[PDB]
Amino acid sequence: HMSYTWTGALITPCAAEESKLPINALSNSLLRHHNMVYATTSRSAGLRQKKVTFDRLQVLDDHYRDVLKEMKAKASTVKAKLLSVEEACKLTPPHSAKSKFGYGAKDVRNLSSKAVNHIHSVWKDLLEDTVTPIDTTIMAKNEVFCVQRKPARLIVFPDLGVRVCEKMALYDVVSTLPQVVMGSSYGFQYSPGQRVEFLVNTWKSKKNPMGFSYDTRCFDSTVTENDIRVEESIYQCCDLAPEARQAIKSLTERLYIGGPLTNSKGQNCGYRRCRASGVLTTSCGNTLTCYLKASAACRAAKLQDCTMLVNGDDLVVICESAGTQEDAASLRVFTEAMTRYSAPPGDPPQPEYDLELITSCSSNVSVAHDASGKRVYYLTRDPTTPLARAAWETARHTPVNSWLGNIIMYAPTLWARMILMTHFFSILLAQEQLEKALDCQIYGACYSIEPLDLPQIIERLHGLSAFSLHSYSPGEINRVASCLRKLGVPPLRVWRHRARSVRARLLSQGGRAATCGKYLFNWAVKTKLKLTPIPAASRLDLSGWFVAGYSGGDIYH
Numbered sequence: 001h002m003s004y005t006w007t008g009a010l011i012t013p014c015a016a017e018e019s020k021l022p023i024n025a026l027s028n029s030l031l032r033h034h035n036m037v038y039a040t041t042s043r044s045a046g047l048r049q050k051k052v053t054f055d056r057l058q059v060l061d062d063h064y065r066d067v068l069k070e071m072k073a074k075a076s077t078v079k080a081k082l083l084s085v086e087e088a089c090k091l092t093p094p095h096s097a098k099s100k101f102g103y104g105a106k107d108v109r110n111l112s113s114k115a116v117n118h119i120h121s122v123w124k125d126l127l128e129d130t131v132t133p134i135d136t137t138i139m140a141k142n143e144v145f146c147v148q149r150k151p152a153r154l155i156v157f158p159d160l161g162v163r164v165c166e167k168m169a170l171y172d173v174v175s176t177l178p179q180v181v182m183g184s185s186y187g188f189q190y191s192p193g194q195r196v197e198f199l200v201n202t203w204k205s206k207k208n209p210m211g212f213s214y215d216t217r218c219f220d221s222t223v224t225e226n227d228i229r230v231e232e233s234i235y236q237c238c239d240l241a242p243e244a245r246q247a248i249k250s251l252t253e254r255l256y257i258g259g260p261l262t263n264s265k266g267q268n269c270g271y272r273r274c275r276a277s278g279v280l281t282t283s284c285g286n287t288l289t290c291y292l293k294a295s296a297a298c299r300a301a302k303l304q305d306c307t308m309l310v311n312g313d314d315l316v317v318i319c320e321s322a323g324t325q326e327d328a329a330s331l332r333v334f335t336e337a338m339t340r341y342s343a344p345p346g347d348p349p350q351p352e353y354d355l356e357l358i359t360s361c362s363s364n365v366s367v368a369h370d371a372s373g374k375r376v377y378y379l380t381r382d383p384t385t386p387l388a389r390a391a392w393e394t395a396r397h398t399p400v401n402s403w404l405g406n407i408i409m410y411a412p413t414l415w416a417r418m419i420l421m422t423h424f425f426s427i428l429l430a431q432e433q434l435e436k437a438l439d440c441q442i443y444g445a446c447y448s449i450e451p452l453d454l455p456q457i458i459e460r461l462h463g464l465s466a467f468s469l470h471s472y473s474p475g476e477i478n479r480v481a482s483c484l485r486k487l488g489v490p491p492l493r494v495w496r497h498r499a500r501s502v503r504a505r506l507l508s509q510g511g512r513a514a515t516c517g518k519y520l521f522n523w524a525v526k527t528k529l530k531l532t533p534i535p536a537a538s539r540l541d542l543s544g545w546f547v548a549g550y551s552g553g554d555i556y557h
């Protein structure tokens with residue numbers, strides 16, 4: 001029962017890979033300690049292969065089956081629709097990997113007869129054949145980090161034609177089923193502000209709250225055939241068209257359960273018997289499986305009044321405390337149960353008694369004050385990785401602008417406001433690129449966003465208090481200040497001076513640009529303005545946002 005079998009053929013790149021931080025005239029204004037920042041490349045793929053290759057053993061008890069029967073009962077209330085070829089095509093990212101069958105993501109989106117005819121052939125093949133493993137491409141991801149160096153993460157994905165077919169069969173399923181099954185526990189239904197609220201209310205709802213996060217070591221490689229067949233049985237509980245039931249069974253047997261691994265050169269790298277990281281069902285399957293194993297492990301450990309919060313493999317549990325020594329014992333029994341279920345830990349879970357000290361989705365709750373002096377809870381994170389990626393993006397154009405996604409997701413934070421907003425608005429001003437739409441990622445999905453719409457977006461997601469937060473906690477301020485020293489990022493006093501300039505420059509341009517100046521940089525002036533709601537913010541269609549997670553799902557809006 002190995003997660004993977006290998007042939008020895010290397011995981012190869014598509015193009016030239018850069019590992020060292022590229023430097024330009026703008027680099028030193030953001031970060032001075034260049035040797036701290038690196039990108040992962042296919043060079044390190046071999047080390048990741050060793051890490052993800054292990055034997056999985058599963059022992060399934062009555063808690064597991066009891067939780068599963070309940071999840072199936074809730075899933076049986078879902079009615080999912082089959083997406084048309086047109087709907088599935090328009091959800092394809094413009095720069096999605098081209099098919100091996102002579103058409104690309106632009107041909108898909110434009111409904112070109114060659115692309116549509118190939119789509120109808122893969123579809124016909126899925127209905128007629130439920131046995132033949134579907135070929136996948138294994139590629140090393142190029143991701144930027146700060147040191148103290150990780151090996152490249154791997155992406156496993158099927159051909160463009162299959163990805164469009166996954167959309168037709170399962171887009172409605174993966175978008176509606178997890179919230180029905182898990183209710184408030186499904187993390188991807190919340191905006192960052194709704195998440196902070198969910199976490200604070202849950203913590204408050206316990207008499208003696210105890211919280212922990214559970215890190216499953218290499219979650220995708222811990223996922224067994226059983227887990228993948230169990231996810232399918234959950235999907236089949238829905239009220240589906242018979243053609244969809246057929247495509248779901250077929251995609252499960254032929255792709256989701258496993259298949260051969262092919263490099264960018266066309267060589268067989270080996271075989272996968274675990275979760276594929278680049279399929280439509282990666283996020284949904286991981287969230288359902290993580291929730292099933294943890295809900296069963298909560299019952300095994302006899303955890304009192306457990307509230308879970310699940311986003312793929314990211315798991316947070318808020319429960320009733322039985323005192324520090326019993327809680328430590330409860331977590332050992334929880335870990336033992338998770339291990340038996342084939343979800344062993346990376347770092348052992350640690351009980352926490354301060355909500356602010358709990359990290360989930362690489363984030364923690366923190367407190368600041370709005371203009372009226374009210375204590376406002378918001379979500380933040382260690383800024384090291386957002387800052388290292390901002391440094392890379394300062395010198396290289398990338399298919400996914402992390403800085404824009406970070407400004408959207410972490411708009412009320414000290415570091416996103418003072419550094420990210422200031423730095424990138426300065427760059428866009430100098431290049432006259434404020435109106436240029438940039439692609440970013442929100443819950444794994446791709447969005448093309450105009451930076452000029454940032455104030456309207458921030459207002460709708462976080463409220464006007466995002467533009468007015470002050471009096472950040474000493475814990476938060478010190479983490480940011482330490483991070484800046486570590487990376488050689490100028491101190492925050494430099495950023496406030498620079499932001500006054502970025503603000504004056506945005507105001508000068510008038511219109512949408514002045515709106516960015518007025519709202520985004522109101523913190524930088526001593527004589528603050530009274531910020532009122534933006535009329536355009538109500539006109540924004542923010543549906544599709546915070547409904548589901550689509551990490552590795554090839555989704556564009």
Ligand SMILES: CC(C)[C@@H]1NC(=O)N(Cc2ccc(C(C)(C)C)cc2)C1=O
Binds near residue numbers: 192360402403405442
């Ligand atoms: C921020 C951006 C670079 C990118 N987009 C996204 O949804 N995540 C994952 C993510 C980010 C924030 C959250 C919170 C906890 C703030 C809702 C959850 C998941 C990313 O890392």
